[PDB]
Enzyme design. Structure first.
Site, PDB file in Angstrom:
ATOM      1  CG  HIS A 151       8.341  -0.627   7.630  1.00  0.00           C
ATOM      2  ND1 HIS A 151       8.153  -1.509   6.530  1.00  0.00           N
ATOM      3  CD2 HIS A 151       9.687  -0.150   7.433  1.00  0.00           C
ATOM      4  CE1 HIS A 151       9.559  -1.759   6.610  1.00  0.00           C
ATOM      5  NE2 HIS A 151      10.018  -0.962   6.955  1.00  0.00           N
TER       6      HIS A 151
ATOM      7  CG  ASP B  97       5.322  -3.386   5.363  1.00  0.00           C
ATOM      8  OD1 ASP B  97       5.376  -1.609   5.336  1.00  0.00           O
ATOM      9  OD2 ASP B  97       6.480  -3.509   5.673  1.00  0.00           O
TER      10      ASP B  97
ATOM     11  N   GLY C 199      17.436  -1.050   5.719  1.00  0.00           N
ATOM     12  CA  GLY C 199      17.577   0.122   4.446  1.00  0.00           C
ATOM     13  C   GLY C 199      17.158  -0.077   3.182  1.00  0.00           C
TER      14      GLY C 199
ATOM     15  CB  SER D  42      12.878  -0.811   4.257  1.00  0.00           C
ATOM     16  OG  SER D  42      12.449  -1.806   5.003  1.00  0.00           O
TER      17      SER D  42
ATOM     18  CB  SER E 161       7.583  -6.684   4.435  1.00  0.00           C
ATOM     19  OG  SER E 161       7.566  -5.959   5.154  1.00  0.00           O
TER      20      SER E 161
END
Lengths: 198, 4
Positions: A36, A63, A141, A143, A159
């Site tokens: 993502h 993801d 942030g 991720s 994720s």
């Protein structure tokens, strides 16, 4: 730039994510991160300099992604922990109940334990299946950042989770946190990558 | 849960 797990990078001069792990694909240098965070060919920047572009990603469903970098980047077998570093030693998957830590640009290095595997997150964009859940806190942030055991075994990349209105799940008890990561194993095999270790 |  020196590539270390946990550091910030921007995508197309807009969104921020965190670096998961340095990896190679033949002579190509890269880092794995969250799918993502960007679309194929989006541009990644570290400290305002272009370091590479998204080479592939899957999101939602899974993801995951890998960014191929220019030859000038320096890959390191390390994950940031404040001013210090955790050495990446491999990717043995830990079991439920194992302690684990995660590193990312918003909350830093946080630790907890794995509480479940094969969890489905119902994101606005579609479901993401097969995630592992830990109770270390995280924020917007984080991720794409690294999930790793203190022994150096890389577990996956951040994720999502139940972030509260303050942008993280650090102000709620561990018992109530759901912080999810994509397993690293299937990302290494899907793209034929090898982890950098030390 | 939300992505992140």
């Amino acid at each position: 730039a020196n590539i270390v797990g946990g550091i910030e990078y921007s995508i197309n001069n807009a969104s921020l994510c965190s670096v998961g792990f340095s990896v190679t694909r033949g002579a190509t240098k890269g880092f794995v991160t969250a799918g993502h965070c960007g679309t194929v060919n989006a541009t990644a920047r570290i400290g305002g300099a272009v370091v590479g572009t998204f080479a592939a990603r899957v999101f939602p469903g899974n993801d995951r992604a890998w960014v191929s970098l220019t030859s000038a980047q320096t890959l390191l077998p390390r994950v940031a922990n404040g001013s210090s570093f955790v050495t990446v030693r491999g990717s043995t998957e830990a079991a439920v109940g194992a302690a684990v830590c995660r590193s990312g640009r918003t909350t830093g290095y946080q630790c907890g334990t794995i509480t479940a595997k094969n969890v489905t997150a119902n994101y606005a964009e579609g479901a993401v299946r097969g995630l592992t859940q830990g109770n270390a806190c995280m924020g917007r942030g984080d991720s794409g950042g690294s999930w790793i055991t203190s022994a150096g075994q890389a577990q996956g990349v951040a994720s999502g989770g139940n972030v509260q209105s303050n942008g993280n799940n650090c102000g709620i008890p561990a018992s109530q946190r759901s912080s999810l990561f994509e397993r690293l194993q299937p990302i290494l095999s899907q793209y034929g990558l090898s982890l950098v270790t030390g | 849960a939300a992505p992140a």
